[PDB]
Amino acid sequence: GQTGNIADYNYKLPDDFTGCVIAWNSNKLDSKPSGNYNYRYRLLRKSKLKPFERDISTEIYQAGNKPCNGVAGPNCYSPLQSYGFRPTYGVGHQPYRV
Amino acid sequence: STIEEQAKTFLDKFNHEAEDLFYQSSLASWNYNTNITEENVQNMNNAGDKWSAFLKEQSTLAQMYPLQEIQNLTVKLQLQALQQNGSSVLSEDKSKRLNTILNTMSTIYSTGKVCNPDNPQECLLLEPGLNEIMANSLDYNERLWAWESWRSEVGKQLRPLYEEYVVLKNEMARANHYEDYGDYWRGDYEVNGVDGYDYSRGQLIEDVEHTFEEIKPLYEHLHAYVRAKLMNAYPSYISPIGCLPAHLLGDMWGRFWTNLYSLTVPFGQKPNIDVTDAMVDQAWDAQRIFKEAEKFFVSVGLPNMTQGFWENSMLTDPGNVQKAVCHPTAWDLGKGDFRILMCTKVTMDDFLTAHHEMGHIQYDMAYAAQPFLLRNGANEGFHEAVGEIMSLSAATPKHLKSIGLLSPDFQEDNETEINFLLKQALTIVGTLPFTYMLEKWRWMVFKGEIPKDQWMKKWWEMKREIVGVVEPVPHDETYCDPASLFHVSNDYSFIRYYTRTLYQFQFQEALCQAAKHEGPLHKCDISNSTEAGQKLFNMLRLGKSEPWTLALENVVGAKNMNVRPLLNYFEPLFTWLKDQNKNSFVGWSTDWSPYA
Ligand SMILES: *[C@@H]1O[C@H](CO)[C@@H](O)[C@H](O)[C@H]1NC(C)=O
Ligand SMILES: *[C@@H]1O[C@H](CO)[C@@H](O)[C@H](O)[C@H]1NC(C)=O
Ligand SMILES: *[C@@H]1O[C@H](CO)[C@@H](O)[C@H](O)[C@H]1NC(C)=O
Ligand SMILES: *[C@@H]1O[C@H](CO)[C@@H](O)[C@H](O)[C@H]1NC(C)=O
Ligand SMILES: *[C@@H]1O[C@H](CO)[C@@H](O)[C@H](O)[C@H]1NC(C)=O
Ligand SMILES: *[C@@H]1O[C@H](CO)[C@@H](O)[C@H](O)[C@H]1NC(C)=O
Ligand SMILES: [Zn+2]
């Protein structure tokens, strides 16, 4: 029952979910000074995801009423954008393993 | 499918990318400031160039969305920030020559040096030697020589450059939607689209005029007292009816009168409150100074500090081989990284500075949730105002006795309070007429009201009529006196300090009323008052999302800046000044001049 970018566009648990959510910090291992851009999250999707769904399709988001014609730029943005994880980051943006 | 829906996604993408790029620029700056080397200089330059390129690209992208089609009043503010057009709207050559003028002015001010005539034995820069002479020396002839020498060295060089600068900035403003560069600067306070809370660019002029008209009696009495003391110091150089001379004010420009405290202290027998020896005898250091400040900010209700903050922040100067800038600064690197860069020593001044910087960081933490374009203070004055209110709250004898720096067996008298209020008056009240006068002259020059052939004549006439300060040697149009100041040379907004001076006292009045304080406002401590912390947090969490009028309403219950907090703060000192100057002619006449 949570509303938010990750909840609706990356991984949605069901309303009647029965399970355990285990999270522990991974800043000691998965943070690099240069910026670990490997990990990515989705911030533009056409609609909300159905519960327990995985969407790996990455095509040019069509925010504009003009056809993107397969390219990006004006009103056409990449669906994925990465976290940049660095050890100096404070709590609230450090990478957590769930 | 609509303008608003399209704008939302673009703003989200820009905020996310700007977070990372601003973090790498800020981290490069922090590394360079802490540890100066060629590699760090290159890294900072590269990060800054990348950030500037990103800002330009996104600004050019964002012009597509008209602002008439956006009706969220937050996306509108973000789009206005993006479309502010920091990239030059003028020609390439015009932008290049504007940058050339700015760089030349900055270089001239920074590298300005004065030597003896036909004598290279001594050559003094501004900060190391000239400022020291102005602050400490009591020689009238030396002070006049230094003042005239600086003016002749800098203003003669900077006059035509500043004329070209004002023409170019007026052209830039006309190219944008503003009238003049004064209008551009006044636009920082402009709030449109919110009925019942709007602020107009023209309203700032009237508000500042009315506030100064209210301040005038207290400043007149302060000027009379300082003039009497300086007459006692220099016998015949000050007239009982004449304005105070410029070079004797304490600093090269007269912005602050704090250097006059030693000469014009009311009661010298009882020393002012000092805790340096006590801190040494109780074995205190910078780490525990910051720990005590953290405890204070917890007690008021603000959140605790971060373990990452404690680990990464360098609160002590490494020294030795390492060289770093020692100007205290609080860094909001972003994404949870909050740091302080301060070569802290064991002084009461450094304790207050640490409180000021931690107030900065608490504000930065408070507005962290808001988007990147809104992660700032509501206007240019609230941020330093929040620093200063904590600075004043943490300097009270009650707080010092509670923390234990002072002996609890002590009791305070009338002379100590009067001396402290007069010192704070020379620090605070003195800079208000100067700031008002400088900003008014700069606005008039931008608007073209003051012609080129009368720039300095009108400047000195307005200074004599407003601040009651007259030049020792009359200056014709060749000199350019205002260009000597750093803010005027580097083109920084200067009414920020006037606004901050009013805002800090309004905040203090509101928080003292919240904290259930009985007594005069100067002896106000908000240490263990939880209600005051929440009342301040109601504004601290907003950031720039809401108008500064609404933020001021949330804190003090008034939608407009008020000076009655300052008047109530200085009421006891005003009574003392009325008692002292009862036999002295309060005010000044424009006729008198040092030159005859
Ligand atoms: C747009 O308006 C909605 C009101 O439903 C608000 O929640 C949202 O925060 C606004 N957009 C931004 C970027 O603040
Ligand atoms: C910014 O400059 C561009 C240059 O083409 C112009 O089209 C735009 O109207 C300007 N925006 C503002 C707010 O002045
Ligand atoms: C968090 O605040 C508590 C008091 O509210 C304090 O004891 C603790 O040390 C703080 N945490 C850190 C990491 O400073
Ligand atoms: C500054 O940084 C460089 C590179 O990280 C390092 O080698 C050096 O020890 C640091 N300090 C000084 C004083 O150069
Ligand atoms: C209050 O201050 C005045 C300063 O004029 C002083 O003369 C008087 O003695 C003070 N009162 C007390 C009780 O010390
Ligand atoms: C504020 O609270 C602290 C912690 O309980 C206490 O030591 C201090 O005495 C209090 N302040 C005053 C003025 O009593
Ligand atoms: Zn400050």
B460-468's contacts with Cβ under 8 Å and 24+ in sequence apart are: B461/B590, B462/B437, B463/B437, B464/B243, B464/B588, B464/B590, B465/B590, B466/B212, B466/B433, B466/B436, B466/B437, B466/B440, B467/B254, B467/B433, B467/B434, B467/B437, B468/B223, B468/B243, B468/B244, B468/B433, B468/B588
Tokens of A92: 């609230």
Closest ligand to residue B320's CA: 4
Angle, alpha carbons B226-B228-B233 (nearest 5°): 90
B4 close to B69: Cβ distance less than 8 angstroms: yes
B335: chain A residues, CB-CB within 8 Å: 89-90, 92-93
B129 three-class SS: helix
Residue the block writes with tokens 């920020």: B496
Under DSSP, the state recorded for B302 is: P
The region that residue B133 occupies, defined by phi over 0 for left and psi between -120 and 50 for alpha, beta otherwise, is: alpha
- Written in H, E and C, the secondary structure of chain A is CCCCHHHHHCCCCCCCCCCCCCCEECHHHHCCCCCECCCEEECCCCCCCCCCCCCCCCCCEECCCCCCCCCCECCEECCEEECCECCCCCCCCCCEEC
**Residue ranges of domains in chain B:** 1-596
Binding residues of B for Zn(2+): 356, 360, 384
Q: Give the mutation candidate from A25, A88, A91, A93 for the B interface (greatest B CB count, under 10 A).
A: A88
B340 close to B311: Cβ distance less than 8 angstroms: no
Q: How far is CA A25 from CA A90, B117, B174, B333, in A?
A: 12, 68, 54, 22
Binding residues of B: 151, 255, 327-328, 356, 360, 384, 459, 463, 497
Please tell me the distance in Å from A19's CA to the nearest CA on chain B. Answer: 30
Q: What are the helix (H) ranges across B315-381?
A: 348-366
- Ligand 2: residues with CB < 6 A are B 63, 83, 85, 89, 176-177
Distance CA B77, CA B72 (A): 9
Distance CA B578, CA A69 (A): 79
Distance CA B67, CA B61 (A): 14
- Number of Cβ within a 10 Å radius of residue B322: 11
Experimental method: cryo-EM
Which of A64, A89, A92 has the CB atom closest to B6's CB atom?
Answer: A64
| Chain A to chain B Cβ contacts (< 8 Å) | 53
Q: What are the helix (H) ranges across B244-346?
A: 276-281, 286-299, 307-312
Instruction: Identify the CA nearest to A28 among candidates A71, A66, A85, A83.
Output: A85
Give the residue whose CA is nearest to atom 1 of ligand 4: B35
Please tell me the distance in Å from A48's CA to the nearest CA on chain B. Answer: 15
List Cβ neighbours of B151 (8 Å cut-off, separation of 6 or more): B475, B479, B481, B484
Closest chain B CA to residue A45: B9
Instruction: Identify the CA nearest to B432 among candidates B570, B330, B237.
Output: B570
Which amino acid does the sequence have at B325?
Answer: V
Which of A43, A61, A90 has the CB atom closest to B16's CB atom?
Answer: A43
Which of B309, B336, B338 has the CB atom closest to A93's CB atom?
Answer: B336
Q: Is A75's CB within 8 Å of B13's CB?
A: no
Give the resolution in Å. 2.8
Distance CA B110, CA B336 (A): 35
B211 three-class SS: helix
* Residues of B recognised as catalytic: 357, 487
